[PDB]
Homo-oligomer: A and B are copies of this chain.
Amino acid sequence: MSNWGDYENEIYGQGLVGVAPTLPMSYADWEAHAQQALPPGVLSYVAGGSGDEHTQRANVEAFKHWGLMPRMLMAATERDLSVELWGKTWAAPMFFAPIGVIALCAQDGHGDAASAQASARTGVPYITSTLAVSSLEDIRKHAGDTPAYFQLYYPEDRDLAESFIRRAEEAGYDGLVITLDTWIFGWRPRDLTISNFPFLRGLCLTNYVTDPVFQKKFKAHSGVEAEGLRDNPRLAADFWHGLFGHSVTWEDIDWVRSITKMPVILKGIQHPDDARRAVDSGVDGIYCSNHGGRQANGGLPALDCLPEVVKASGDTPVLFDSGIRTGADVVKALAMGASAVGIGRPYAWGAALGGSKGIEHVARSLLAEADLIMAVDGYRNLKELTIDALRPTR
């Protein structure tokens, strides 16, 4: 931290000695260049959302309709952007949201590792998807000293789900995010046009391929032993697909909580009574998301739901993602009451242009801007950033 905004001193300082930037500085340039730098299947998969993508787009537009009220003569010369979440201190109110194909957003095929390493160097927590090229144990090592969270895609096999949760607790993950909006895949025209579904080609199934329950059950089903599977994951792509997506129930969440000491955080919550029942049932975190609009095109921007989710959540921490493109967006979601803000699409572009360093550049750019907005506009820390600081705007 020192302050996050300091990052611009280094960019400007390097220019004075004839060293120009090598990466873009804004989302639009990140996206413009990344999309052309990626393979076409990956582009379709990462850029593409659900239906005509109105929701994915509305998520982003929502942020143009709040404004922060600037406060003069506050002298917010030292900012404190840290947040304490479930016992751990985060250096920044921001985290890498789960991205199951981030491995493939990077030219070397290890974008997930690259993401965890960027987390290690910045202190921006990495939330690893269940889908991945590096196993969740290797990820947690790459994440260093920085808090790391495990996002569970809950499978149709209780033994496997518990193996994932156990392995995550044993690997030293700091919390468990259960994604509630992706037990089945939404209608995605960009991927359907080219019949692009990479997991069914055996990509990003390392966490299944390495899991003892999956290995045992797939051998029972196919005759294939653990070595043959690891050498050709695609052999178990159809088996993966059959068990991948369990539709999670309230009773499931009570079960998960009783078998692990990790805090449980539910991702996909939009409705305040869903947030109410979760919190009243002892769930530890509420993660307001609509999955980037990638999974259902119902039209409701995530950000429209965050205020009532915050109120219903009470002192239970609320995470927010879906539509964050800049540091401005990050400040506005924090002001509405999110404790920490997830970053998706922007760091996938980071990966496409620069690997671990590109990801690190996105994270640091987003936080520099947020911190400089708080300084100029007179908010010295996140406790002072309250929802009454924002104003609706045409």
Contact = CB atoms under 8 A, between A and B. Distances in A.
Q: How many copies of this chain?
A: 4
A359 interface: no
Interface in A1-52: 5, 8, 11-12, 14-29, 32-33, 36-37, 39-42, 50-52
A68 B75 CA distance: 39
Interface stretch (A117-125, A138-146, A207-215, A367-375): A367-375
Contacts of A222: none
A323 to B, nearest CB: 13
A181 interface: yes
Given A75-B248, A75-B249, 12 more contacts: A12-B200, A14-B195, A15-B194, A18-B18, A18-B201, A19-B201, A23-B39, A51-B327, A69-B305, A70-B268, A182-B376, A297-B327
Contacts of A268: 70, 72
A181 B68 CA distance: 14
A18 B21 contact: no
Contacts of A69: 270-271, 298, 300, 305
Contacts of A270: 69-70, 72
Nearest to A203: B19
A290 B70 contact: yes
A62 interface: yes
Task: Give me the 4 closest cross-chain CB pairs, A-B, nearest first.
Answer: A15-B195, A67-B300, A68-B298, A67-B299
